[PDB]
Amino acid sequence: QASEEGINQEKCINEEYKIWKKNSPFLYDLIITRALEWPCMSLQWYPEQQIFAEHGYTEQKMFLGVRADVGKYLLAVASIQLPYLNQLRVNISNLYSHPESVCSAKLMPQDDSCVATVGNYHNDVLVFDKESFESYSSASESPLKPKYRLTKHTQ
Amino acid sequence: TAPTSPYAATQEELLAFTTIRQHLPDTLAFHKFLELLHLYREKLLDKTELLNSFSKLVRNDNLTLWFSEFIRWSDNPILVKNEPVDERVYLPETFECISLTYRKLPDSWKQDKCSGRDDLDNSVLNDDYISVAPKPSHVKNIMHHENQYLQALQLVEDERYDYDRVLNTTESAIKILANFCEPTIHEHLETALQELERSKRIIKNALIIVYGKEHANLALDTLFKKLPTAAPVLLKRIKTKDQEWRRSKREWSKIWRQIEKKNAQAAFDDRYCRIEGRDRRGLSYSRILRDIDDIYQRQKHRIDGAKLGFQFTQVLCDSLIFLNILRLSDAQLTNSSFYSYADKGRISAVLKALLSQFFGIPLLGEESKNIIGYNFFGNATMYVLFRLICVCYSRLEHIKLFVESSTIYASSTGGYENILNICEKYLKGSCSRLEFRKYLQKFNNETCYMICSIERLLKVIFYRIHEILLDPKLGQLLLLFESDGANSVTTPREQMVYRNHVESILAPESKIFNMRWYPLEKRLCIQQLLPADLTMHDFENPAKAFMYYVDSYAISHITEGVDLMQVKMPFLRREHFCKSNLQLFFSTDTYVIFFEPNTENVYINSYDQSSQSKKQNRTTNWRRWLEANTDIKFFSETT
Amino acid sequence: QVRQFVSPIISIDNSALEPFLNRYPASESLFPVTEYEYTPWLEFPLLYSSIGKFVRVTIDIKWLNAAINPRLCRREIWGTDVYTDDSDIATILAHCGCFSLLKPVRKIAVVDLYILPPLVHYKGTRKNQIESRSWSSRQDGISLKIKEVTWKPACASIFENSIHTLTLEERLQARLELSRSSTFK
Amino acid sequence: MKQFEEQIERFKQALFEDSDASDSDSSIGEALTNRGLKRKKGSKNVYY
Amino acid sequence: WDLRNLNQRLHTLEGHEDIVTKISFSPHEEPILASTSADRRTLVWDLSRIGEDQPAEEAQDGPPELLFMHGGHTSCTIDMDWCPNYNWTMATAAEDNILQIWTPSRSIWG
């Protein structure tokens, strides 16, 4: 009996889908849909930018924290192609496993290398820096360790 | 010369309106003006709003005033009062019943007296029981009066009655007034003035007829005073009117006689008339459509537990009856007068084709056909055509069965066939209708009364078919039919793309009608499909259902089987390099879409003081709208 | 500089009906006699014996849609502020100004209507873009007037909200499971 | 301009239209009441 | 909310018919505000349209200070962020493992 409601609901979710998909070329000037591996808990745009004028685009950067699974909690960096006005893919890379969960991962405004990460699973704030990302090696069995551990809270 | 219709457009108003359109600088402005008028007609456009838009399109004051004068506009406080009706008009049905219709009276109603009752009548008459008739509530099969040759006679009789009452009134008034006109009238006036009070009504009615209900009182008074010189002018007028009306009645009685002859003969048949009237009132285009629509609407919402499915079902057994119908059709077609020489061939061909192709009438590895029901998709015209054909078939077949099973006219070799040959004769013009009907009367049967309706049914059918032959969208449609008469056993996707073709060939507004043929049972089923409806209602297992759905989601313009009453549109109703890498993943038990990872979809379209000033207007209007150490800190931070 | 015209005012004097509206006292007119579930095929009975009491109708959300309801377009409403008992209750709501036809509604309605003796004249006036018709002959039913309209705080429970009660990560883990088997592409 | 004249006449007829009228093509048969079936071409002549 | 008048809600924007979760301003123009909610939509409001007039049919989509509405997702959108290097562009991550980079047409705001 509850199936009926759930399946109807899922179906109109699908409905909204291609009814947005169908009239997209009359609504947007750009659409890039990416089916990443994992659920991305957060995103933050990167203020540094590459401009490939002769090639004809720009790449921006993105910082994601995703879960692969329960307990598999990871971070990644993406490069994003935007087209050029003045005269096309989403690339995942830089994937480092996190010690515990990420609910919010904020990078310092005037220095990208640092990221304060916290999650719904721990009361400790873990702040990462240059060396922590660059001393990590994807071949290693252990995750990173942040620049500092900040703990005052109990939740 | 040419006749003026009621409330016909006058010349002044047509002149003024064409000058209005001329002042309107564009034909687009004229079209907008027609739109204003039409939207006011369709109860979406108010009066004052019509005036306002008219002025904001005409930009001229005198024409606005002329419109407000033509629109008959008046701004006053509309007063609405609600007055209940008197207690005695409904109170009876609260009285303590005694029988079905007789209800005991309450003491407050046995409290008024009749003053001429003696001691007898206070013991015979009934005092405390009323007769409260019963009240229908929601009658839903209304009978009509079908005899239309009886009502013409009744109209003749009413018209001559109305002439008579008038002529008689003017006669009597002429008599009295002419009595009041003489030389010696001034002498003995108080006697004539007494024969006028005793006859005031006849003269009042004569005045009402000759002048009107406004001048009647005037003339009556003015003659009560100035009698011996008012009487002659009235007499002259009334005699002139009388003469002309008598002259008119003569010349129209010239015609009443012919009416009475013809219809008096042909009006002693309340058998033929009920049948024919109910028939003709049944097979009206809009009535057919409304019937099927009502049934469909009752299904969609499950009002009485009725679930969706088919709305019309009927079995067509014989295969020769169709050839009989074709025979009758061609017989009548050679004797019509609407269509030119080639349309006869066209319509005969179209009927033959749609009969043979669809109905499959000749003009462990083979059952797959009889298991696949053949599908036809069309619009209202096709549905009406097929309803007519099924009705004609049903009536012919009932005729044949009744001729055969009934053991009186079956004893002849071809009684049914005799009927067929007689109808053949008649439809070509070789026999008239009187012999036809009197010969029909031999059967004494309403079931055999039903044979005459074939001419009407065929006329409607020919009309539909012809309007299809001029329907330029017909071709593909029937051609599409031809196409789907070649498959062996269809997989859904073919039928769905067929249906999408059909639904596309029509305008965006239309319905679809689905007609399905089961040659195993030889059954015709009809249904009505709107955008988001299921074409195949029966699935024997959830896996089959999921398969058909996914196929539909793939191809079908709008997913079949989804509750449109629940969709909520997700947007407000207001050198390029593109690469698509997306696979729609489905579950088979929850229908959730997933995506296979590493999917890229990109859409690219290659094609300031305004923004800052809008920002500033925001700041300004919003600030205009607007008008503890915390305030200390803030005011340290303010400017 | 455009001329601006003002459509007139509309005044309603339901003062003669006062002995009926107040026939029964308050505190003893709490329960409607009978209750109906609106559908475009609803027909009240004759209710002569209970004049001065009220009934309770219940309208679903789909019925208040000018596209689903077929009766909404025929304009079957006679009267102003007191209507014949043939009138379509949806049109009564939309004409007495309890919702708008252009914006779609999202709640269940519970309407409570009065029962009133017939009237001598039913006046038809245009409001909210709904032009109720007029009846000058004698009516044979009774009349209805809106006593009060109450909307349902919860009409239906969209399942994405019932699952919205669950925690993000928890419900997200069951998401991954469904993504595994899926039995098809 | 014949079509325009027909349009003007149609608009005049719409203005001319009475406050209360019968729109449905089907008329009221015998039917002995008007409840339910008003707007039925002659239902002003019928009552209890 | 405005800090010199905190006794009073500055204004209230309507249009989501269940829980709204998260919001963000545009780092290029201030009058543009983005909001994400549980009904699978993200709404963009141009606040320069307080108090404006709107036609009858224009009132269907919501108050006139509503600008745009994006619903290409299929579940609760997790979060958003504006790309600060390009105008009118935003990236949204949702619960169904989907990322969306999108910017509306010029025509609505140009």
UniProtKB/Swiss-Prot annotation, chain A:
Cellular compartments annotated: Nucleus
Domain of life: Eukaryota
WD repeats, residue ranges: 97-129
Self-association and partners: Heterotetramer of alp13, clr6, prw1 and pst2.
Family: Belongs to the WD repeat HIR1 family.
Function of the molecule: Has a role in chromatin assembly and chromosome segregation. Involved in the deacetylation of histones.
Protein name: RbAp48-related WD40 repeat-containing protein prw1
Source organism of this protein record: Schizosaccharomyces pombe (strain 972 / ATCC 24843)
Residues of the full protein shown: 14 to 185 of 431
Swiss-Prot record, chain B:
Name of the protein in question: Paired amphipathic helix protein pst3
Annotated signal peptide: none
Entry keyword Repeat: yes
Domain PAH: residue ranges: 5-74
Annotated GO biological process: double-strand break repair via nonhomologous end joining; negative regulation of transcription by RNA polymerase II; transcription initiation-coupled chromatin remodeling
GO cellular component terms, semicolon-separated: chromatin; cytosol; nucleus; Rpd3L complex; Rpd3L-Expanded complex; Sin3-type complex
Keywords: Nucleus, Repeat
Predominant place of localization: nucleus
A molecular function GO annotation: transcription corepressor activity
Region of the whole protein represented: 399 to 1146 of 1154
Superkingdom: Eukaryota
Cellular localization per UniProt: Nucleus
UniProtKB/Swiss-Prot annotation, chain C:
Record-level GO BP terms: transcription initiation-coupled chromatin remodeling
Keyword annotations: Chromatin regulator, Nucleus, Repressor, Transcription, Transcription regulation
Signal peptide span: none
GO CC, any one term: Rpd3L-Expanded complex
Primary location class: nucleus
Segments passing through the bilayer: none
Subcellular location: Nucleus
Domain of life according to the entry: Eukaryota
Function: Component of the RPD3C(L) histone deacetylase complex (HDAC) responsible for the deacetylation of lysine residues on the N-terminal part of the core histones (H2A, H2B, H3 and H4). Histone deacetylation gives a tag for epigenetic repression and plays an important role in transcriptional regulation, cell cycle progression and developmental events.
Family: Belongs to the RXT3 family.
Subunit structure: Component of the RPD3C(L) complex.
UniProt name for this protein: Transcriptional regulatory protein rxt3
Organism field: Schizosaccharomyces pombe (strain 972 / ATCC 24843) (Fission yeast)
Phylogenetic lineage: Eukaryota, Fungi, Dikarya, Ascomycota, Taphrinomycotina
Gene assigned in the entry: rxt3
UniProtKB/Swiss-Prot annotation, chain D:
Domain of life (superkingdom): Eukaryota
GO cellular component: cytosol; nucleus; Rpd3L complex; Rpd3L-Expanded complex
Keywords: Chromatin regulator, Nucleus, Repressor, Transcription, Transcription regulation
One GO BP: transcription initiation-coupled chromatin remodeling
Principal localisation: nucleus
Compartments it resides in: Nucleus
Description of the deletion phenotype: Leads to sensitivity to camptothecin, thiabendazole, DNA damaging agents and microtubule depolymerizing drugs.
Annotated family: Belongs to the RXT2 family.
Function according to Swiss-Prot or TrEMBL: Component of the RPD3C(L) histone deacetylase complex (HDAC) responsible for the deacetylation of lysine residues on the N-terminal part of the core histones (H2A, H2B, H3 and H4). Histone deacetylation gives a tag for epigenetic repression and plays an important role in transcriptional regulation, cell cycle progression and developmental events.
Subunit structure: Component of the RPD3C(L) complex.
Name this polypeptide is given: Transcriptional regulatory protein rxt2
Species of the source: Schizosaccharomyces pombe (strain 972 / ATCC 24843) (Fission yeast)
Full-sequence portion shown in this chain: 1 to 48 of 240
